[PDB]
Amino acid sequence: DSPFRAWDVFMVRTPVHLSLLRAACEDGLMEAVELASPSLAGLLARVARGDTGGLKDKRLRRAALALLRYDIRMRTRPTPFGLFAGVSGGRFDTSAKWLAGTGHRTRTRADMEWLLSAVHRLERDRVLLAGVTVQAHQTLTVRGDRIVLDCPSALGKSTVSARRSPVVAEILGAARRPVLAGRLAQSVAQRFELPADRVTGLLADMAAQELLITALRPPLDGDDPLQHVLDVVAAAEARAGSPAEAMSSESAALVAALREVDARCHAYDRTAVGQGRRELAELIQSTRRVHPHDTPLHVDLRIDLEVRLPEVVRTEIERAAEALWRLSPPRRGMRALRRYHEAFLERYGADRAVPLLELLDDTRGLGPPAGYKWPPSETPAGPQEEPRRSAALARLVAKAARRGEREIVIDEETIAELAYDEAAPADLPNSLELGVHVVAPSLDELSAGTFRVVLAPGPGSHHAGATLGRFTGLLPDVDAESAARQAGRPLHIQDAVAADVAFIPRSGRAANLAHTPSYSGRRISVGLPDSGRAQEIPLDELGVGANLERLCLVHLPTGREVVPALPNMVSAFAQAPNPARLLFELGLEGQRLWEPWDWGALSEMPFLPGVRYGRTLLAAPLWRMDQLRGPADDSGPAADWDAALDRWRAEWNVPRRVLAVSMDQRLLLDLDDAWHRVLLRDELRRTPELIAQQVAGDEEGWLDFPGHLAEIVVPLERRDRHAARPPHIRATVSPTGAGGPWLYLRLRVPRRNQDDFLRDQVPVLVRAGIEHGADRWFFIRYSDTAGQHLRVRFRGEREKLWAGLLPEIGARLVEWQRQGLLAGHELGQYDPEYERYGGDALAEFTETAFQHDSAAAISLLRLTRRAGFRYTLDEVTAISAAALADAFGPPAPVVEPVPLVGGLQWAPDLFDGDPAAAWMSSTGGRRELPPDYRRDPARWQKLIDPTGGWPLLRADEDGCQVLAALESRDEAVRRFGTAYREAFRPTDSPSTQLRLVGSLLHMTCNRLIGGSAERERSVLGLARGAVQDNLNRRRH
Amino acid sequence: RRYHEAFLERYGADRAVPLLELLDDTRGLGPPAGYKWPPSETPAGPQEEPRRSAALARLVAKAARRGEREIVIDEETIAELAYDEAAPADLPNSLELGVHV
Amino acid sequence: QRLWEPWDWGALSEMPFLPGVRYGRTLLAAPLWRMDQLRGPADDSGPAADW
Amino acid sequence: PTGAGGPWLYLRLRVPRRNQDDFLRDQVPVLVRAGIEHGADRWFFIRYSDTAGQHLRVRFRGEREKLWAGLLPEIGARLVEWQRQGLLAGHELGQYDPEYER
């Protein structure tokens, strides 16, 4: 019954004074500390052998607290770290089970930062280099005569700018897909008639600047990185002649030194927990031979533990996930691409695809969206989001306070109150991952339904399998179910191609967490070589299109959408090159995304109750620790602190045991314990925004089998798997200046002043343009980043325009500034958008319409100044709209009535003989008629009557002057409409003509009124209603 | 406040502008954001968040636990709610309070 | 001139009850009850005792 | 209060900040030589931010005819070529207010 169904399998995360130092020396914990902090391990080594150089009475107390953090961690922190905690398989079943064992196993791998230092040394070997394959970095961008790489990887070591010579360009083009470096270097030598080695040194410089990527570098596809380097050099050795000349001398020295580290890794992985302290020190100095690094190892721990949970729990979690979804923001996609999507719509419209990469380019495109770090975006972030405010949430807290309860219970009536709206099933995401604690008094009472599910602290994921990803190999059990489900993952766009994005992370910490396999059909490598394990879907084949609701990724060669996923938990925001991050966020477009429980403004309260839905704690109970900040750090007695604690503890009813939570720490503390009480003080001085959570199960007494010390990660997929959305495929492709076919002026006449400027000053400009031979002119009202202004355009011969017209114009423009008529002027580039107007063959008809409509508007505004002129601007504009609609003439024939935005079934045959009503109908929904029309339709029908020959208007002297001022522009539109029907084909999209005339209606409003979207809708409404009613009134 | 910044940026600190020319859309800065008569075309700056205070919140919570309809604040509360130490040079000339006694 | 303002509750204005604030004999802010809950029973066409 | 008439030619070149140093190294010199052979007597550049982002402003001073009928169209041809090569997004011609009082 939930819209989400959980997977059968799931992953489990779980942990395994000078006296306190001496005490824990008998704990092999000593192996864990040798791994996490060799420095602390050193100190423990010279207390076990006997206290040497006096130490430091500050350092004794400093080192003990560090050790205490590691002890507590090893026994309470589920977060898979080194030898402190690790992972295991688990399953939903009909019978609960919890078999804790002791046979824990380690997997040990080379740290990526460490391994890359060596790969670099192998990359300088020109003879080895020809043995491997090379390819062009996927994010190179061409600027002028230079090749540019934004954000190279600094891993084993800001921007790279190389000159793009013909040799350089040939190399990059031939290495578009991965190609053998030797065969590459030989071809380039031929073509350019060069030394076949001087070229190889070029490939080497390029691979060093990261303009090329050698196969030597680990693909991050899920394999062991170290083994990947070895397999590759082995491919090179066994291709030349004898594994001696294939690569130089000391390169094979480095190679052997790496195979040794490999060998000692498996050796140490044979060892048990606490027992391999000798093998570990043996692995360390081995790696140190290759290169001395602070942290050259990454260790994952497989926990010996069998966990099974009954179906009643799987159902709780599924119902919880639903709750969080219904309570989520009324948004599709990440918030980070909402303004970008609008920007995209504004610049490109909804029928154009832009090669991803050109879109991301500062110069050629939109650039990266606000906030993107790599390279940093220059686009400003929009308004910040206010922490939420809810009368509903506040009540929950207030009541819980009166009655002194630490948890409040919400039901369907509570959820119906918090929902920003009714969440539509079409918006359900493809997948997600919740990490939870499951707690109960006993395995058996659990089986019977006496348990709690507590949503764990930390971020969730938006991909089923992401969290399990980097633990691949360790749980053969779940890896095979995982790979099978992801192989058939649900998609939300019909016919979409699924793919996985793989990228090199910016930091070496995250780089160690990116060894994660791809199970979609495809992989998009960004800043990494292709992988042998996955068919590459090349970045440069990708485009971005848009509709009113979402952006969308398109594989340009085939016209199918792509739905990329990021199958690990590396943070795209913090760690990913921009294109990679864009791929990630685009994949989540069109999906409404769940978020943790949001307390909003209420987060300031000193205590927040846990929130329960059925058996699930959506949010744990919560204690701020502000009051304790001052009593912490006061250089005073241990009881001077303890008192403030007890005072705080009793004032808000804080339990004896708390979880101390920040971004970096979960910290299980017993506040009865004297050591834990000082640890909390140090931690608070250190992390000021720290909070306290009630431990899972404590509130129900259950803290006396270990569900609160274990995290369960359970993936869930949309139950109804079918893709709700059709693709949006209209994939497409695509410069003049101060030279001059066009003179394009920006006149900074503020809006209030514009009508007068148009009546009096623009005529002067038009007269000047004419006597200098300008053949076309027009004006529009425009608003840019600098406000509202007028833009006037002239077309003519370059010399006459720039040496004759421009200085006459400029002198007048300077006079007008002194008289205070405009603040200033600029000259800008004109990019004519004939595609909105039927294409380049129709351009002359478009320019003409624009010229004559411009002249008409000036005429009308000039009538409108006169005292006594009967008609308002809205009237003459309505008159002008209807007159244009009449003038365009009959539509092109239709195949099917067109689905219109208003629900109207737009159909040419409905409007035989009445082109005015035809076109005015495409302009709005019948209900969107303005008030002023509905309260008085008898008037507007009588006034705005083009089909009837404009009888009432021709009575009035003023009404006549209105129609005369529109003749020439009616003529122009008539011709345009004619040549337009002439060039029609029944094949053409029905949308072209509806958008064209609509554009023509919009510009008539722009020239006359507007600088107001509502005003345009009213004025168009008036005309729409009037001509529609005149048509209906005829035959009744 | 943004008007004051706009001014320094365009005119500097060694120049007076006839009031009215300053207010003119074309010749000056125009009216400041929000002015109704005539309406300014200047965009308003970032909107101000309703304040959030751990200090304000404790007072509400404490009052709630103990069911009290009043909370009593002293100098220690004021030292905590003050955004800063107000300078005597910043004292206003005058003000008017309406009260019930 | 630094300009005085009324007592500002800020985001906390959503709370169903706000206690009055007393600074030795002066009530800087009166106590305050929101009436969200009473909105639905209002306009409900029912008996005078139902309200 | 001066304008498109022309003691000053004032260019706004929409080159994003990350790209500017390269543009100043390679492209601005081309513009400066063009200004010289058309008899411009002074030139300078500044980095500026207006409402449409970070850009470069390049200014030339010279005789009106040489500036607007000679230099400007040569400059312009270069400006569109460079735009095609992805070096700048666009250009405008703006008014110059020398702030000599400062």
Task: Identify whether the C-beta of residue D58 lies closer than 8 Å to the C-beta of residue D76.
Answer: no
Return the amino acid letter for A8.
D
Q: Is the Cα dihedral A1000, A1006, A1007, A1010 positive or negative?
A: positive
Evaluate whether A446 touches A92 at the Cβ level (below 8 Å). Answer: no
User: Which chain B residue's Cα is nearest to A386?
Assistant: B49
- Please choose, from the candidates A1014, A1019, A1003, the residue with its C-alpha nearest in 3D space to the C-alpha of residue A857: A1003
- Count CB neighbours of A690 within 10 A: 22
- Residues of B with a Cβ under 8 Å from any C Cβ are 49-53, 56-57, 59-60, 63-64, 68-74, 78, 86-87, 90-93, 95
Residue of B17, B20, B23, B26 to mutate when probing chain A, most A C-beta within 10 A: B26
The strand ranges marked E within A645-797 are 657-661, 666-670, 691-694, 711-718, 742-747, 776-784, 787-795
**Selected residue of A390, A402, A604 to mutate for chain B interface (largest B Cβ count, 10 A):** A604
For chain C, helix, strand, coil in percent to 5 are 15, 25, 60
Q: Do C12 and A601 make contact, defined as CB atoms within 8 angstroms?
A: yes
Size of interface A-C (CB pairs under 8 A): 25
Residue reference for tokens 């030589």: D33
Contact present, A632 and A685 (Cβ < 8 Å): yes
Q: Which residues of A touch B26 (CB under 8 A)?
A: 748-750, 753, 820-823
Kind of pairing, strands D8-13 and D53-61? antiparallel
HSE-CB at A554 with a 13 A cutoff on CA atoms is: 26
List the strands of the sheet with A560-565, edge to edge: A354-355, A542-546, A551-555, A560-565, A497-503, A522-526, A535-536
CA of A382, closest CA in chain C: separation in Å? 21
For B54, nearest residue in chain A (alpha carbons): A604
* Beta-carbon separation of C16 and A393 below 8 A: no
Other Cβ atoms closer than 10 A to D36: 14
Inspect the interface and report whether the beta carbons of D3 and A827 lie closer than 8 Å. no
Structural resolution in Å: 2.7
Minimal CA separation from D51 to chain A, in Å: 5
Closest C-chain CA to A395: C16
Q: In which residue are the tokens 């967490």 written?
A: A513
Ordered DSSP codes for A528-569: SPPPTTSEE--GGGEEEEE-SS-EEEEETTTTEEEEEE--S-
Within 8 A by CB and 6+ apart from B14, the residues are none
List CB contacts (< 8 A) between A822 and chain B. 26
D86/A145 touch (CB, cutoff 8 Å), yes or no: no
* Cross-chain Cβ contact A391/C12 below 8 Å: no
* Six token digits for residue A342: 């609008």
Q: How far apart are CA A417 and CA A421, in angstroms?
A: 9
Q: List the one residue out of A696, A592, A605, A612 whose CA is nearest residue A415.
A: A612
Nearest-by-Cβ selection for B60 from C15, C22, C23: C15
C-alpha A779/C-alpha A412 separation (Å) is 58
What single-letter amino acid sits at A427?
Answer: D
CA distance B101 to A585: 61
Torsion region of A894: left, alpha or beta (phi above 0 gives left; psi -120 to 50 gives alpha): beta
- Closest among A807, A918, A46 to D63, alpha carbons compared: A807
User: Residue A893: what are its φ and ψ, rounded to 5°?
Assistant: -65, 145
Technique used: X-ray
Instruction: State the Cα torsion A713-A718-A720-A723 to the nearest 10°.
Output: -150
User: What single-letter amino acid sits at D100?
Assistant: Y
> Burial, D22: exposed, middle or buried (Cβ in 10 Å; 0-12, 13-18, 19+)?
middle
Nearest CA-CA distance, residue C20 and chain A, Å = 16
**Contact: C11, B52; criterion CB under 8 Å:** yes
Please enumerate in sequence order all residues whose Cβ is within 8 A of that of A733, keeping only pairs 6 or more positions apart, or say none: none
- Cα(A381)–Cα(A423) distance, rounded to whole angstroms? 27
- CA of residue A195 relative to chain centroid, distance: 47
d(CA A31, CA A36): 9
The answer to whether B65 contacts A402, with C-beta atoms less than 8 Å apart, is yes
Tell me the CA distances in angstroms from A302 to A86, A88, A225, A991, one per residue in order.
5, 6, 19, 60
Sequence length of chain D is: 102
Distance from C-alpha of A126 to C-alpha of A1, rounded to nearest angstrom: 62
Cα separation, A771 vs A800, whole angstroms: 10
Whether there are 3 or more C-beta pairs closer than 8 Å between C and B is: yes
Please tell me the distance from the alpha carbon of residue A929 to that of residue A1017, in angstroms, as a whole number: 8
3-class state of residue A939 by DSSP: helix
Closest alpha carbon to A473 in A221, A260, A219, A99: A221
Query: Minimal Cα distance from D83: which residue of A?
Result: A735
DSSP per position, A184-246: HHHHHHHHTT--TTHHHHHHHHHHHHTSEEETTS---SSS-HHHHHHHHHHHHHTTSSSTTTS
Of A818, A829, A878, A861, nearest in space to A1015 by CA:
A878
Mutate to test the interface with A, among C15, C18, C34, C37 (most CBs of A within 10 A): C15
User: Chain C contacts of B86, Cβ < 8 Å?
Assistant: 2
Decide: A344 and A367 in contact? Cβ < 8 Å.
no
Cα–Cα distances (Å) from A493 to A496, A588, B52, in that order, read: 6, 11, 42
Nearest partner of A591 among A718, A732, A736, A489, judged by Cα: A718
CB contact under 8 A, A604 and B25: no
Peptide bond into A375 cis (omega under 30): yes
CA distance A331 to A109: 41
- Chain discontinuities in chain C, listed by preceding residue (C to N exceeding 2.5 Å): none
Per-residue exposure over A751-765, b if at least 16 CB sit within 10 Å of its own CB, e if not: bebbbebbbebbeeb
Cα separation, A794 vs A818, whole angstroms: 24
**Nearest by CB: D76 against A737, A809, A828:** A737
Peptide bond just before A637 cis, omega within 30 deg: no
Residues B72, C8: C-beta atoms closer than 8 Å: no
Q: State whether A390 and C14 contact (CB < 8 Å).
A: yes
- Could you give phi then psi for residue A1007, rounded to 5 degrees? -65, -30
Give the CA angle between residues A865, A867, A868 to the nearest 5°.
120
Q: Do A425 and A720 touch, CB atoms closer than 8 A?
A: yes
Task: Please count the other Cβ atoms lying within 10 Å of the Cβ belonging to residue A507.
Answer: 16
Grouping H, G, I as helix, E, B as strand and the rest as coil, residue A578 is: helix
Distance CA A615, CA A953 (A): 74
What is the length of chain B?
Answer: 101
Q: Which residues pair with C29 in a beta bridge?
A: C21
Cα-to-chain-centroid distance, residue A728: 19
Q: What's the CA gap between A261 and A268, in Å, rounded?
A: 10
DSSP SS3 for B29 = coil
Amino acid identity of A685? R
Sign of the Cα torsion A172, A174, A180, A185 reads negative
Instruction: Please report, to the nearest 10 degrees, the dihedral formed by the alpha carbons of residues A895, A898, A904, A909 taken in order.
Output: -20
Q: Which 3 state secondary structure label does DSSP give A382? A: coil
Distance CA(A561)–CA(A809), nearest Å, equals 51
Which chain C residues are closer than 8 Å to B60 by Cβ?
A: 12, 15, 18-19
C-alpha torsion angle, residues A293, A295, A298, A302 (rounded to 10): 140
Which among D1, D19, D75 has CB closest to A817?
D1
Token pair belonging to A102: 């002791």
- Sheet of strand C26-29, all strands in order from the earlier edge strand to the far edge: B70-72, C20-23, C26-29
Nearest to C17 among A387, A393, A398 (CB): A398
Max Cα-Cα span within chain A:
114
Q: Distance between CA atoms of A594 and A970, rounded to whole angstroms?
A: 54
| Residues of chain C contacting A397 with CB distance shorter than 8 Å | 15
Query: Which residue of chain D comes nearest to A162, CA vs CA?
Result: D22
The CA distance from D8 to D58, in Å, is 10
| Cβ within 8 Å of residue A843, ≥6 positions away | A832, A834, A837
Q: Are A357 and A141 in contact (CB under 8 A)?
A: yes
Nearest to C21 by CA among B55, D40, A392, A567: B55
Question: Is residue A681 a contact partner of residue A661, using CB atoms and an 8 Å limit?
Answer: no
* Separation of first and last alpha carbons in chain C: 50
The answer to whether A370 and A358 are in contact (CB under 8 A) is no
How do strand A305-310 and strand A97-100 relate by DSSP bridges?
antiparallel
A468 is written with which tokens? 């399990």
DSSP readout, A450-469? --EEEEPSS--BSSTTTTTG
Q: At what angle do helices A991-1008 and A967-982 cross, to 10 degrees?
A: 160
Size of interface B-C (CB pairs under 8 A): 60
Q: In what order do the strands lie in the sheet with D8-13?
A: A776-784, A787-795, A742-747, A825-827, D91-93, D8-13, D53-61, D42-50
Question: What's the CA gap between A8 and A93, in Å, rounded?
Answer: 8
Instruction: Count each helix (H run) and each strand (E run) in chain B, helices first.
Output: 3, 1
Are the Cβ atoms of A391 and C16 closer than 8 angstroms?
yes
Longest Cα–Cα distance of chain B, Å, equals 62
In contact, D79 and A737? CB cutoff 8 Å: yes
- Close Cβ partners of A926 (under 8 Å, ≥ 6 residues apart): A902, A904, A1028
Question: From its phi and psi, is residue A117 left (phi > 0), alpha (psi between -120 and 50) or beta?
Answer: alpha
* CA gyration radius, chain C: 17
Cα–Cα distance, A841 to A843 (Å, whole number) = 6
DSSP A80-111: --SSSEEEEEEEEESS-EEEE-S--EEEEEE-
CA distances from A308 to A313, A482, A544, D83 (A): 10, 17, 44, 63
A284 vs A297: CA distance, rounded Å: 8
User: Helix, strand or coil for residue A907?
Assistant: coil
Q: D17, A378: Cβ pair inside 8 Å?
A: yes
Give the distance, in angstroms, between the CA of residue A413 and the centroid of all CA atoms in the same chain. 34
Name the residue in chain D with its Cα closest to that of A739: D73
Contacts of A626 (CB under 8 A, 6+ apart): A606, B54, B58
Cα A749 from chain centre: 39
Report the length, in residues, of chain A. 1036
> Which of A734, A790, A744 lies closest to A349, judged by CA?
A734
When scoring A388, A395, A608 by the number of chain C Cβ atoms within 10 A, the one with the most, hence best to mutate, is A395
Torsion of CA A533, A538, A543, A547, to 10 degrees: -10
3-state helix, strand, coil in chain B (%, to 5): 30, 5, 65
Minimal C-alpha gap between A711 and chain B (Å):
31
- The residue assigned the tokens 């990803």 is A469
- The number of angstroms, rounded, from the C-alpha of A863 to the middle of its chain's C-alpha atoms is 53
Return left, alpha or beta for A135; rule: phi > 0 is left, psi -120 to 50 is alpha, else beta: beta
3-class SS letters over A665-702: CEEEEECCCHHHHHHHHHHHHHCCCCEEEECCCHHHCC
Phi-psi region of A839 (alpha: psi -120 to 50; beta: other; left: phi over 0): left
Backbone angles phi, psi at D43, to 5 degrees: -145, 155
The amino acid at A253: A
Element (H, E) at A141: strand A141-143
Collapsing DSSP states into helix, strand and coil, what is residue A384?
A: coil
CA distance D85 to chain A (A): 5
Q: Do A820 and B56 touch (CB under 8 A)?
A: no
CA Rg value for chain B: 21
- List the chains bordering chain A where 3 or more Cβ pairs fall under 8 Å: B, C, D
Q: How far apart are CA A815 and CA A821, in angstroms?
A: 9
Question: Please, which residues have CB within 8 angstroms of residue A429's CB and are 6 or more apart in sequence?
Answer: A325, A462, A492, A588, A591, A592, A593, A594, A718
C-chain residues near A604 (CB < 8 A): 11-12
Q: What is the enclosing helix (H) or strand (E) of A67?
A: helix A57-76
Q: Which helix (H) or strand (E) covers residue D93, if one does?
A: strand D91-93
Nearest C-alpha neighbor of A678 from the set A183, A199, A69, A261 = A69
Q: Are D92 and A827 in contact (CB under 8 A)?
A: yes
Contact: B92, C1; criterion CB under 8 Å: yes
Task: Please name the member of A387, A787, A822 whose beta carbon is closest to the beta carbon of B52.
Answer: A387
* A827/D64 CB distance under 8 A: no
Distance between CA atoms of A888 and A849, rounded to whole angstroms?
A: 11
Chain-centroid distance, C-alpha A81: 28
Q: Please write down the HEC assignment for all residues of A973-1029.
A: HHHHHHHHHHCCCCCCCCHHHHHHHHHHHHHHHHHHCCCCHHHHHHHHHHHHHHHHH
- Which candidate from B57, B71, B90 shows the least CB-CB separation from C19? B71
For B56, name the nearest residue in chain C, comparing CA atoms only. Answer: C9
> Which letter does DSSP use for residue C33 in this model?
E
Query: How remote is the C-alpha of A917 from its chain's centroid?
Result: 44
Q: In A, what residues contact C, Cβ < 8 A?
A: 387, 389-391, 393-395, 397-398, 601-602, 604
The Cβ of residue A443 has, within 10 Å, a number of other Cβ atoms equal to 17
Beta partners for B70? C20
Neighbours of chain B (3+ CB pairs under 8 A): A, C
